[model samples]
Target: KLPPGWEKRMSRSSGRVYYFNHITNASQAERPSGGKNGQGEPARVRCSHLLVKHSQSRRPSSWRQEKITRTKEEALELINGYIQKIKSGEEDFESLASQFSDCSSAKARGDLGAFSRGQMQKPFEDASFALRTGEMSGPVFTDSGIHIILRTE
Candidate 1:
């Protein structure tokens, strides 16, 4: 057995994503467990900032990315709106990106640092590689959330 709240210990082995049952301002309320190395989960939360990952798909490709959200509902709404655009074929890839992205590359109109398939999350790499630089795409889902893609060639 673990030390009463030992599971809530701050650790580095927990990787990135974590789950919460009760919402308290409890510092170090989550911990990594069941590992052989006995290392700690590096993931911590100063606030409710969650790394929401979503997916994207073209008829030919698929990809995934991380979106930051304070709540699950906020993450859902943001991703759903983008997914709607992909289904409607009104995805102005770069321009839509200018409107919603929080990433630094959002400044480059969603350039996403020059299109390396590996640099992106899995679903993202697939969806992005399928388009021809201006082709509209379809919506997809991932561990993060939902996504709509428009390739800028």
Candidate 2:
């Protein structure tokens, strides 16, 4: 059985279902706060991704990628700069992803959209789920080159 205040939540993207204890505070509700699963463990999280791939390595398994020749340091600098812009609200994540990302989703404003566990590469999955919604992560390196991700959902 679920907890006293528990309720089901559904993913708009995948139509999957999960449960969590509802919090009445508006602000707190925006963040996940370690709700219990029916087994009494913390519930798993779902995530969405925007990837900025620096091409030159193996193509991304998750999406098609275009390559540009840049040293790792150069790619890191570029992603770091993008992170700064995102943090400052000078550029929104979707716009930046469209302008700079090499992934196929760049056309969709860098939106790879929502995913559940095991749908992405392990490193990418780890980084993505570790972040809260609206959080940005990376300069994460994989065989696909440098990836800067924004957790959109």
Candidate 3:
């Protein structure tokens, strides 16, 4: 019998089968498992960052390199106001990011997409995973600039 948390998965198109172990984060298959394989479900953290990057000087192009118009302290103050608005239900994170975030992710409402641990910069990554689902974080600073993060899942 399969162990408690082990699961058998079947592919609909190919009709192939696979086994996964939830606890050990491993897999058992017809062949040996190795070589950069991803198995089992971990508590994946999906989040977005509202980046008010140093004035790129500007947007749509050459933004990452442009000089910032606002001082770091000023930027933090601006973002904190938005965070409070979000907390009070006066505004939404995606809407704010789309309107004001300096990073290109603003196009997708600051979505950095779903990422596992170690995929992001240490400071950003730590802040992202540390939040509870549906919770917003205060500003997190990185070399590029300040970020207001939200953990969606």
Candidate 1, residues 26-103: lDDT per residue as tens digits?
A: 122234233235543222111101122323212211123342324446556776666566446787556666666544
lDDT for model 2 comes to: 0.58
Alpha-carbon lDDT, every model: 0.42, 0.58, 0.67
- Pairs that collide in candidate 3 are 55-67, 55-68, 56-66
Displacement of residue 53 (Cα, Å) in model 3 is: 1.9
Sort by TM-score, best first: what order? Answer: 3, 2, 1
Error of 1 at 85 (Å): 5.3
lDDT winner among the candidates?
A: 3
Name the lDDT of candidate 1.
Answer: 0.42
State TM-scores per candidate: 0.41, 0.61, 0.63
Model 2 regions lying over 4 Å from their true place = 1-52, 60-67
Best model number under TM-score: 3
- Tens digits of per-residue lDDT, candidate 2, 58-117, equal 753334433355656776788778877776789887788777776677787877767766
Candidate 2 or 1, higher TM-score: 2
In model 1, which range of ten residues has the least summed lDDT? Answer: 42-51
Stretches of candidate 1 off by over 4 Å are 1-74, 83-91, 141-146
- The predicted structure with the larger TM-score, 1 or 3, is 3
Supply candidate 1's per-residue lDDT for 125: 53
